[PDB]
Amino acid sequence: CPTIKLKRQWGGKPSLGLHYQVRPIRYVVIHHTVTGECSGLLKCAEILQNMQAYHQNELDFNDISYNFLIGNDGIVYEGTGWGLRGAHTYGYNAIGTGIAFIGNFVDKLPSDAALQAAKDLLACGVQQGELSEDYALIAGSQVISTQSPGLTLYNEIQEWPHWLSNPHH
């Protein structure tokens, strides 16, 4: 079970509005940030802080759009966190957990540590009752008009158990 970097622990601002999710959650949506990569708290916190500010100020979201975000270091950074609605995926915020790999993975994969942290996050979520034992894992590109999480990353995750090939758009 990965130790999650909580919101305060990376210097993030409190959410401007809470919307509680049903438990358990049935969909996990995978994204990339279309940002540079990062490792370690110092560079990861800068990106997340700027991203949250952009989401709250320019995009009018209550908080950083993703539920969780994962760095090259293989640490899971709390975005909206478990049980709270983000704004990462149209039609899948209330009923989904949005997980973004930090970086751009059209042409490359995230680090092995990032990929393993993600699998651990999903298994622990099932174990803790955060996710349905038969949760569906999907790419953002399956359900909204986007390339996220990037073709290469997309090719990776369609091989994990729980991948669902036909989620509703």
Numbering used by the authors: 11 to 179
Sentences from the paper on this structure:
The Drosophila peptidoglycan recognition protein SA (PGRP-SA) is critically involved in sensing bacterial infection and activating the Toll signaling pathway, which induces the expression of specific antimicrobial peptide genes. Contrary to the general belief that PGRP-SA has lost enzyme function and serves primarily for PG sensing, we found that it possesses an intrinsic L,D-carboxypeptidase activity for diaminopimelic acid-type tetrapeptide PG fragments but not lysine-type PG fragments, and that Ser158 and His42 may participate in the hydrolytic activity.
We have determined the crystal structure of PGRP-SA to 2.2-Å resolution and analyzed its peptidoglycan (PG) recognition and signaling activities. The crystal structure was determined by molecular replacement, using the structure of PGRP-LB as a search model. Although the crystals were grown from full-length PGRP-SA (177 residues plus 6×His-tag; residues numbered from the N terminus of the purified polypeptide chain, as determined by N-terminal sequencing), clear electron density was visible only from Cys11 to Pro177. The H2 helix contains one turn of rarely observed π helix at its C terminus (residues 64–70). This helix, together with the L1–L4 loops and the central β sheet, forms a prominent extended surface groove, which in PGRP-LB includes a zinc cage. However, PGRP-SA has lost two of the four zinc-coordinating residues present in PGRP-LB; accordingly, the rPGRP-SA crystals exhibit no X-ray absorption at the zinc edge, and we found no electron density for possible metal ions around the groove. PGRP-SA contains two disulfide bridges (Cys11-Cys134 and Cys48-Cys54), whereas PGRP-LB has only one. The most prominent feature of PGRP-SA is a long surface groove demarcated by residues of the H2 helix from one side and of the L1–L4 loops from the other side, with the residues from B3, B4, and B7 of the central β sheet forming the base of the groove.
